Amino acid sequence: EVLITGLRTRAVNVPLAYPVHTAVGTVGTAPLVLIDLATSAGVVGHSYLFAYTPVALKSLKQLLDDMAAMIVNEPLAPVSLEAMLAKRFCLAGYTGLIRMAAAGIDMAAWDALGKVHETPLVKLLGANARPVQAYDSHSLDGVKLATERAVTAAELGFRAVKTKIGYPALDQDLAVVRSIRQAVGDDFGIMVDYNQSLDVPAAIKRSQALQQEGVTWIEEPTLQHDYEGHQRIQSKLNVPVQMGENWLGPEEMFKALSIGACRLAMPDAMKIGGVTGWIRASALAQQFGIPMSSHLFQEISAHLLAATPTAHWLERLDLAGSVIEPTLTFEGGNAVIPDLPGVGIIWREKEIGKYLV
Amino acid sequence: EVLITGLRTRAVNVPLAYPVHTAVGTVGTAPLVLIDLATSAGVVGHSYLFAYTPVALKSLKQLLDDMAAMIVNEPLAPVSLEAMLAKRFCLAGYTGLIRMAAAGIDMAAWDALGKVHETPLVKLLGANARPVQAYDSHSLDGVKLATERAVTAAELGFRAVKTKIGYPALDQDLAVVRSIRQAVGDDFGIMVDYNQSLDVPAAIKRSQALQQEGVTWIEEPTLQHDYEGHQRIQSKLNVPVQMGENWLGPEEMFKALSIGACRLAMPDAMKIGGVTGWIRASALAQQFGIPMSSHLFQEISAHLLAATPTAHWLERLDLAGSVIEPTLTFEGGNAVIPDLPGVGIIWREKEIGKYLV
Amino acid sequence: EVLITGLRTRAVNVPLAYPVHTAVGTVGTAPLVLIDLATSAGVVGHSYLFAYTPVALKSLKQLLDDMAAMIVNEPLAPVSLEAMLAKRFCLAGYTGLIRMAAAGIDMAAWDALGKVHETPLVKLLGANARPVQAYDSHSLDGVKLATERAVTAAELGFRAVKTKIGYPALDQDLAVVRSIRQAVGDDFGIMVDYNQSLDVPAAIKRSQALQQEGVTWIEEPTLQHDYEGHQRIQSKLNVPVQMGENWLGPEEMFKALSIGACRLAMPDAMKIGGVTGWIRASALAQQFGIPMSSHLFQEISAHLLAATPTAHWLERLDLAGSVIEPTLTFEGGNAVIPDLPGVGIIWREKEIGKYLV
Amino acid sequence: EVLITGLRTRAVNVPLAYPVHTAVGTVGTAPLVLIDLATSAGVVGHSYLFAYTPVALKSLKQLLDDMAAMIVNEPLAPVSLEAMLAKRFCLAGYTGLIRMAAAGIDMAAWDALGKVHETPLVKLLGANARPVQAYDSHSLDGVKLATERAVTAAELGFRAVKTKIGYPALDQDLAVVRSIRQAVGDDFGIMVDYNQSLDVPAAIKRSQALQQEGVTWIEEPTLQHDYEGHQRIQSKLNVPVQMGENWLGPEEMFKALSIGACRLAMPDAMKIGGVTGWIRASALAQQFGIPMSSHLFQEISAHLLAATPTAHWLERLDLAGSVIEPTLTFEGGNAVIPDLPGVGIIWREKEIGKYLV
Ligand SMILES: *[B]([O])([O])C1=[C][C]=[C][C]=[C]1
Ligand SMILES: OB(O)c1ccccc1
Numbered sequence A, B, C, D: 001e002v003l004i005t006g007l008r009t010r011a012v013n014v015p016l017a018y019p020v021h022t023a024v025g026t027v028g029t030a031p032l033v034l035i036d037l038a039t040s041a042g043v044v045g046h047s048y049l050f051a052y053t054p055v056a057l058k059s060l061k062q063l064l065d066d067m068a069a070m071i072v073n074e075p076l077a078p079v080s081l082e083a084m085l086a087k088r089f090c091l092a093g094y095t096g097l098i099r100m101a102a103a104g105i106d107m108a109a110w111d112a113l114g115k116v117h118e119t120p121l122v123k124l125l126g127a128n129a130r131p132v133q134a135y136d137s138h139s140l141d142g143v144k145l146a147t148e149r150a151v152t153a154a155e156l157g158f159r160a161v162k163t164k165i166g167y168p169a170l171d172q173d174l175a176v177v178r179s180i181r182q183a184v185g186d187d188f189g190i191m192v193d194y195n196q197s198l199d200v201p202a203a204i205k206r207s208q209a210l211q212q213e214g215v216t217w218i219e220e221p222t223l224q225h226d227y228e229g230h231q232r233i234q235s236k237l238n239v240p241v242q243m244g245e246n247w248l249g250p251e252e253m254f255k256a257l258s259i260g261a262c263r264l265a266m267p268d269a270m271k272i273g274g275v276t277g278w279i280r281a282s283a284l285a286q287q288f289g290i291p292m293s294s295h296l297f298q299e300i301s302a303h304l305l306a307a308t309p310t311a312h313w314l315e316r317l318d319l320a321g322s323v324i325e326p327t328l329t330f331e332g333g334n335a336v337i338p339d340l341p342g343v344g345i346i347w348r349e350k351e352i353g354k355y356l357v
């Protein structure tokens, strides 16, 4: 009785207070596609996608706009919508940009369904809202800024930070971790992210060194698709290997967990397949005994983790803050879901125009 | 903002048009516990449990009555409720009767949540209602009654039946299947169910004979907890081994699927953990590539299968027809979800009194 | 030919001198079902069940009373009795409360059979009575009470104690172990019990820290049914992982040992299936090379371990002392089987009335 | 040093004499992106991509146009180019449409490199040109048209055809195969392609029936990413399971071969990663003992198979014949590489104009 009536997308390049430097390149602006899903019920679903590089930004918008005719006049039934897209793209390949587009549609449809029922997403999924501990996610910032941002994070009440490492020398990785540690004290989380930058022997050598220093987890040490190599790295470590942000669909998560690639998981609300894919990913993490965190998309991830049996950490990295009202808040380091229907996304319409492609 | 305000259970022994004879004993009447979950929104959630033997009926109701103190005044959030029950029973053993009672609470809570939102359960879960093929489920009836019941089922539009086998001789198993097949023709499903009655070598011998005869699946050939033995049986067969009705929680399903016990699965809405458990089981079946059917509880299973990516068959075995209004209908052998909020269970209040224990 | 003539059950809530605090809740009083099995030979068998939570207490009594008609007029043949119950409950689910109930019948039947033959249980099983080293089992008591209780146990002649841990911080776990170690010295056993309270990475981190401190075993680090997770934890440790109190039947022990979940086992006389299940569990532990301890039920466990080829420790935790004569004694920390027929259980009939439900 | 000096893309929707009907939908016209890679040597590399659905057509062209900045002024060294693209898209996801775009650049770059050296691509790779046996590839055509196209293919000299199957009834699959077989005789190949349309149990049942009829291979019986399910299907067959057209990169082929998903492989020159990926795929097939065929892209696949140690069949399915001069010929069913530099693609420039989007 509630039909999808239209799809509107806006491609933006939004500024970042701090560029996200990684060992494999810098993300200085966030290329985003903002999504509005119109319905016959007088509500509009909102979601957005992260294109990672501006090279893929216009292609992703064009893809979504050409997909509108697939979903317009279909019922607002996101699980059924997802199965339809899966089958329609089964020859072309239901992965990559195509899967990311379907995930954006999925996330806007669930927002709209929450609005239809005038209830937050987390409650529509049958769970209570709860605060979720969050770590402040930084980047490959150099010892000076990394220590400064770590101190500010602790001052704002976060109990952990993530820095991105993979400097030319191991001693540079260690100097950054040591400087943060001396500034925050022992009772504080320091996660580190290599962004796929090491080969397997280098990952073992750097990770065992970092493990001696004291870190909370070691994230994507090597190529994301190399589940076997991640298993070999994890086999040489006590500290948990963490991965999952690049899993395109829960089927990729299933392959990785099946061979023991990691003791922690952090799906990406976009790449895992939206709310629908997240729910399936959480069922897997529960059965494999994997504490499950989020990657980006903090607005919807606060709802999703509240419904996740093995919920671990929320990643605070506010890529869309310049175009989304800050209804999501942080109290004592914990993300607090807003008392709003659906996801709680309200566009900053006066700001969006500044960034349109 | 919506709280549970009461729990009421009624234990009944209800009549069956045909006793469910099995290889390991006869269920002549259905011992049920009917559950009413009152809420601060006025609506009342309805579910029921199947105790299998009257020996367990009063024990199950007593357990549920003593569990009221754990859920009354809690939010109507089934997923959070389930996590609380899992933790509170973790020393006692969150399995068996305790797990079945938690599932009954879960199913009533989801019915109530659908009622709060004035929407059928399938749509609350994000899926469209679709008709789902049902087989008419019979029992260890002997050649004559098995054939007559198969003919009546075909006349009612069903495209498959299930008979329960495990007679003293294999030739008696074969005689029933052959007689059904003569009466219904080649283009018709005949599922067979041993109800755990064989050892592994006997299962292999009888199953290969049934395979030659022509059957749709072979269900629970040996002890339900012996997943390894089911794998060995399946390794000698082309016809699929079917199991799952006795999995207590998705964790037992995960163990069976992990070792290849069966090529088909049929979780029981009660034993698998209610809606919350069924959704998790549904995610496992998709990733393991297992077509997923239901066992009993046709009223809620029609909703649940419509949301299940690998949905296969609905088992039609109407244990509670004498106390529940026939709002679930069958058109051309397909179960049709009624346009009613939540599950669509309406008590026959004047009938329930005739059967109270 | 000795027949069973009747079954009498009494549900009691008995006081504990020290509540059993665990990381997942406190057992402040012990809910027990006391069992009398009447026979045609003028002897009555005695046993009891531990319901863990009062929520299950009346349900468990009701179950046993409704099972009386299954066993009355049957031969006093516990092994044959066990097979009949397994079959009768094979549809309902021969696990959880049902399996615990059958175990209570088994344990009283073997007591009565010892009485028929005027001989202690251990001798009826073909073994010599022998002293069995026992550890004094405490709980999550805090550093001060844990140290005081450890000293008291040392003064009484015990060579080991178990404390339950899983405080909010690892440093709190370590502080308790350190303060016990200061007070008892190096030549003394300190077992620790997490009661399923940790996820797999937290278990590895905490267990590797406790291992450096010096502990005797690490019991149930994670969810009891997660055998694979227990193996992953054990794979990171030199100290043995200990589990088994929550195995419902030897078949669950067989699954856990087959995948290497633990290097020690401790079946629970109730949950493992009584004497009949214990003897089978002992055969499994011998072949898998697993030293085998007990959990609770110290009265019957002294008999059982004396017949167990890999017998390790007896757990001294006197749940039923307020209603059972102290015929079991401890000399130099060793449990000493009483020279009484059957198990040596004599009811304190004057005390039982004070705690009836 | 030769540099890339420009990249031009043209999106076309070209006509097909016969629509490619499949069990999951029909490709009635071919959406292609034609690629021109201009170089400082004057020669222009040519290649094209198949978008499968018009829904992806403009998005793929937009992506390629925005990738121009990454490759213009880079050396014409395809292997180094591919490494650079893999690194640049390692955050976005080097798969799906992005990977197909990189493959189109790779195939154009190798054609240009053959042109720089005035030599056919096969000779550039160090192999002699040799005729490659080709099967005429049809679709889900129905009994009458399937048989007519098979008869025509046999008259044109082909020794094998492929039909696409997965009709509603297995009996219809069999009728098509039987009708073809009567018309072409026993000494003739009949490949069949389910295009992922079956679940695992249905694949086993249909495939064992097909194997009794006599077919040459069974292609993509189930979901393309379900390598484990393909292994289970292959475990029940003597006839080989064939897959590969949907592997995105040789790394996906490595995962599938590592678990034994199939006894035949058929990489797609586009999805596998162009020439560079094909050569890596061919090294894998050799070591795993897998006869390796092609999927689509017949113009360059004739060159690549002549260099492939386990080369098996070439798929003749002429998607681009409306826009590419017919320099590739077929003698006695064998593809014959043209005596032209690089790949031998010459645009039909006056025809391309008719199909531009
Ligand atoms: B056991 O030793 O783990 C136990 C648990 C709860 C109460 C008593 C003993
Ligand atoms: O946490 B991540 O790996 C990340 C990568 C790129 C941009 C932002 C975050």
Ligand SMILES: OB(O)c1ccccc1
Pocket (backbone or CB within 6 Å): B020, B022, B027, B137, B193, B195, B245, B295, B296, B317, C091
């Ligand atoms: O389908 B079954 O296995 C079943 C068993 C007992 C009663 C009813 C149905």
Ligand SMILES: OB(O)c1ccccc1
Pocket (backbone or CB within 6 Å): A091, D020, D027, D137, D193, D195, D245, D295, D296, D317
């Ligand atoms: O052979 B193939 O599977 C194919 C699929 C779609 C279009 C063309 C060819």
Ligand SMILES: [Mg+2]
Pocket (backbone or CB within 6 Å): A193, A195, A219, A220, A245
């Ligand atoms: Mg990362």
Ligand SMILES: [Mg+2]
Pocket (backbone or CB within 6 Å): B193, B195, B219, B220, B245
């Ligand atoms: Mg059955």
Ligand SMILES: [Mg+2]
Pocket (backbone or CB within 6 Å): C193, C195, C219, C220, C245
């Ligand atoms: Mg314990």
Ligand SMILES: [Mg+2]
Pocket (backbone or CB within 6 Å): D193, D195, D219, D220, D245
């Ligand atoms: Mg194909």
